[PDB]
Amino acid sequence: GSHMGTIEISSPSKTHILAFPFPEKGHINPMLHLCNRLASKGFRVTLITTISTYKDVKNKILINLESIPDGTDKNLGMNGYFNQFKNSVTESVAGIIEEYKLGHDFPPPKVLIYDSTMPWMLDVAHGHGILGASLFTQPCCVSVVYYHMLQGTIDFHREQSSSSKVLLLPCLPPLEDRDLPEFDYFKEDSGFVSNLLLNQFLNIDKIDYVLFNTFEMLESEIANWMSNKWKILTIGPTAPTAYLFETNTEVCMKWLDEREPNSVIYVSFGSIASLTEQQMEEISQALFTTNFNFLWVVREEERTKLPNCLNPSSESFTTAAGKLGLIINWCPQLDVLRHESVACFMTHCGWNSTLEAISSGVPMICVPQWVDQTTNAKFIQDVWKIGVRVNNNNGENGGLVKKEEIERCIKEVCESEKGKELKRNAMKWKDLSKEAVSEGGSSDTNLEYFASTLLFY
Numbered sequence: 001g002s003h004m005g006t007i008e009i010s011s012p013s014k015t016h017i018l019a020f021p022f023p024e025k026g027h028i029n030p031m032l033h034l035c036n037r038l039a040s041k042g043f044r045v046t047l048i049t050t051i052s053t054y055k056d057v058k059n060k061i062l063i064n065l066e067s068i069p070d071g072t073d074k075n076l077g078m079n080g081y082f083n084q085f086k087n088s089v090t091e092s093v094a095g096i097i098e099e100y101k102l103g104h105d106f107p108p109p110k111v112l113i114y115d116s117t118m119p120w121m122l123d124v125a126h127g128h129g130i131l132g133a134s135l136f137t138q139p140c141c142v143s144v145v146y147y148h149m150l151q152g153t154i155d156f157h158r159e160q161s162s163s164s165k166v167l168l169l170p171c172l173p174p175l176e177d178r179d180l181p182e183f184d185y186f187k188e189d190s191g192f193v194s195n196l197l198l199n200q201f202l203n204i205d206k207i208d209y210v211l212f213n214t215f216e217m218l219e220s221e222i223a224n225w226m227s228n229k230w231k232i233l234t235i236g237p238t239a240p241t242a243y244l245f246e247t248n249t250e251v252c253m254k255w256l257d258e259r260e261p262n263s264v265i266y267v268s269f270g271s272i273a274s275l276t277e278q279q280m281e282e283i284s285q286a287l288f289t290t291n292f293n294f295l296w297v298v299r300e301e302e303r304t305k306l307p308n309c310l311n312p313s314s315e316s317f318t319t320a321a322g323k324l325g326l327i328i329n330w331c332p333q334l335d336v337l338r339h340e341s342v343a344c345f346m347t348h349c350g351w352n353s354t355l356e357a358i359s360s361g362v363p364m365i366c367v368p369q370w371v372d373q374t375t376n377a378k379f380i381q382d383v384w385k386i387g388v389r390v391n392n393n394n395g396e397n398g399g400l401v402k403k404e405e406i407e408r409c410i411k412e413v414c415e416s417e418k419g420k421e422l423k424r425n426a427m428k429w430k431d432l433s434k435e436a437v438s439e440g441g442s443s444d445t446n447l448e449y450f451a452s453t454l455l456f457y
């Protein structure tokens with residue numbers, strides 16, 4: 001009694017978060033993990049995705065799901081394709097924000113978490129009166145290389161046949177030419193892919209929340225350098241400690257359950273990369289002669305590039321070394337990596353696979369293909385010391401990696417005493433990533449900072 005007044009409560013359950021990943025699995029997956037964490041804190045979370053990825057996201061998922069049209073003419077070059085994409089999703093998401101601003105079941109949107117490679121989405125959020133959070137899907141270390149490239153002072157031009165160069169940037173180890181992000185692979189479209197990653201920093205000072213899927217201890221020096229400059233929040237890994245529903249889960253878990261512990265080489269080049277027939281044959285011949293079992297993901301659209309001596313969703317093998325192999329179109333990667341049967345991970349070093357391996361304690365054989373995969377491999381081998389990087393036959397990044405070189409790297413990681421060290425290092429980093437996302441860890445604290453401040457008056 002006695003008093004008279006109204007109390008108003010701002011809590012996660014009446015706070016509405018919008019999330020909009022770039023429509024590729026290396027962008028969708030870290031976003032979905034973050035959304036799962038945010039729903040667990042009680043927030044209302046709506047995931048917006050393009051119609052052509054919608055069924056994939058639906059199969060994987062508390063989370064409200066909205067589709068938007070693709071904006072993909074499929075007939076234009078990369079520049080016109082992306083600009084149509086930008087225009088379509090700009091009006092699409094603006095529309096959704098406004099429906100929800102006038103709705104009554106849901107709270108009005110408080111923030112839009114958008115993919116860092118769609119920086120024009122900050123203009124949509126701010127133009128419609130809500131906060132913007134930019135989710136980077138690459139590590140801090142390679143992201144700052146893009147910032148220095150955008151600043152245009154340092155010369156990143158390279159004529160690698162004339163001389164060799166080493167680049168020193170603040171709070172980064174020296175970077176050889178092969179350590180830089182790889183854009184020449186894209187040939188005529190190299191400038192476009194380049195611009196797309198440089199432009200992540202066009203509005204960096206206007207972003208309300210700068211979110212990186214990494215943990216501070218993994219990237220201490222450069223994260224501090226970026227925290228001083230832009231007040232970033234390292235919130236990773238967004239994947240949980242010991243999930244997304246992936247395909248072939250029961251098949252892969254049953255197969256791995258029937259293998260000896262620490263006996264399986266897990267091989268994946270991610271969702272996008274496509275290897276030449278020659279490269280596939282080098283890998284095949286290594287795997288069929290090594291002293292280990294193997295689980296090798298070859299995507300459906302890549303099966304025809306397999307060697308002549310090998311359509312079918314999966315194939316089982318006894319190898320020429322007496323071991324067992326399984327070739328499959330897709331696997332639950334996080335569950336595979338955390339299986340006791342897995343000895344090591346031959347990976348293209350996409351950032352999600354890298355951080356999922358780190359979070360799982362699995363040493364890597366690095367076969368980087370392009371963009372940040374080269375830089376990631378440099379850190380895996382020489383900084384975190386949890387893998388070895390293959391050497392391309394010719395000196396180049398697009399050069400063939402021979403079976404003998406693959407074999408050499410298997411023997412080092414899996415049979416040598418150096419490999420036992422690499423595995424010790426990987427369990428150390430596994431514990432540190434677990435510590436970062438547990439109560440009082442830097443990533444747990446940073447993600448709570450994001451969540452708590454959303455509630456502020």
Ligand SMILES: C[C@]12CC[C@H](O)C[C@H]1CC[C@@H]1[C@@H]2CC[C@]2(C)[C@@H](C3=CC(=O)OC3)CC[C@]12O
Binds near residue numbers: 024117189193272
């Ligand atoms: C570099 C890029 C954008 C930045 C994000 O990190 C996602 C990657 C995926 C790979 C890359 C895109 C940029 C667009 C791409 C060139 C695009 C392609 C168009 C094409 O004809 O071949 C591939 C699909 C995806 C793509 O291959």
Ligand SMILES: O=c1ccn([C@@H]2O[C@H](COP(=O)(O)OP(=O)(O)O)[C@@H](O)[C@H]2O)c(=O)[nH]1
Binds near residue numbers: 026272334
């Ligand atoms: O057989 C597979 C291969 C990949 N992935 C997942 O797909 C993502 C691949 O992203 P990454 O950044 O490693 O490389 P990209 O596909 O973008 O080249 C990661 O979340 C993997 O966990 C998977 O679930 N099953």
